[PDB]
Amino acid sequence: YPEPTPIYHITHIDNLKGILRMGKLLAHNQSPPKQRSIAYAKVPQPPGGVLHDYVPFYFCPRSPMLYAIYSGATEYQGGQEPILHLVSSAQAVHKAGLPFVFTDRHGVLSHARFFRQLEELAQLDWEAIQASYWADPPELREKKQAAFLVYKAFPWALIEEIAVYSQRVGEEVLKILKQFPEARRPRVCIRKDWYY
Numbered sequence: 001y002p003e004p005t006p007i008y009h010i011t012h013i014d015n016l017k018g019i020l021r022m023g024k025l026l027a028h029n030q031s032p033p034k035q036r037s038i039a040y041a042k043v044p045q046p047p048g049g050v051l052h053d054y055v056p057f058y059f060c061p062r063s064p065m066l067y068a069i070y071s072g073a074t075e076y077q078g079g080q081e082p083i084l085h086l087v088s089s090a091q092a093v094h095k096a097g098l099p100f101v102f103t104d105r106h107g108v109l110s111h112a113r114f115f116r117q118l119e120e121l122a123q124l125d126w127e128a129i130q131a132s133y134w135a136d137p138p139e140l141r142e143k144k145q146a147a148f149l150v151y152k153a154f155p156w157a158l159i160e161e162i163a164v165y166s167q168r169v170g171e172e173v174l175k176i177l178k179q180f181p182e183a184r185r186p187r188v189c190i191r192k193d194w195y196y
């Protein structure tokens, strides 16, 4: 498995002020003050609960979820340009002492496997996760959506990089970061190769 093991959370730039003000991402069930959601299940490892009790990450950028945004398949119609990739690592979460679990596919699938030890990152399909071509077979899309789940909240200061589609969005991100001079200022990188 890649070490450190990057984890990616995609979110609309309109959510960044709320993340910086709270100093964290909040799990769905912890009522984040979201401005845009990009939406179109029990967790059997401790600390248990359901998927929406965790802040979720993928193990790749340019995810199938981002393709659904790009293709207008979400209720959200603003497309990929305003969507940030927030980058951290699985090892940082462990080092910070935060409870996590991770899956080998979307956890709602009956055959989904759940893990809580970093050595079990070997159980994931890294061919699917890292694939640039994932149209067929259908299982590639499923296994590409392996997720890293952090219970209840994810501190902003674990984010190492904000990746953006364009110069204009990179500049907007820096304007927002400068409104919270106490908040960690990660590097901001234009990564067109992480988008469609």
Ligand SMILES: NC(=O)c1ccc[n+]([C@@H]2C[C@H](COP(=O)(O)OP(=O)(O)OC[C@H]3O[C@@H](n4cnc5c(N)ncnc54)[C@H](O)[C@@H]3O)[C@@H](O)[C@H]2O)c1
Binding pocket: 008, 009, 010, 011, 012, 015, 016, 017, 018, 019, 020, 022, 024, 025, 026, 027, 028, 032, 033, 034, 035, 036, 037, 038, 039, 040, 052, 056, 057, 058, 065, 147
């Ligand atoms: N976003 C991802 O990278 C990702 C990864 C894995 C799975 N998923 C699932 C795909 C599906 C839709 O995703 P999404 O729109 O992220 O989930 P969601 O519909 O649960 O909406 C939560 C939203 O709140 C945002 N948010 C969190 N904390 C704050 C805060 N402090 N202030 C402002 N906004 C905040 C978060 O970034 C996200 O946009 C959900 O079922 C997710 O669990 C998403």
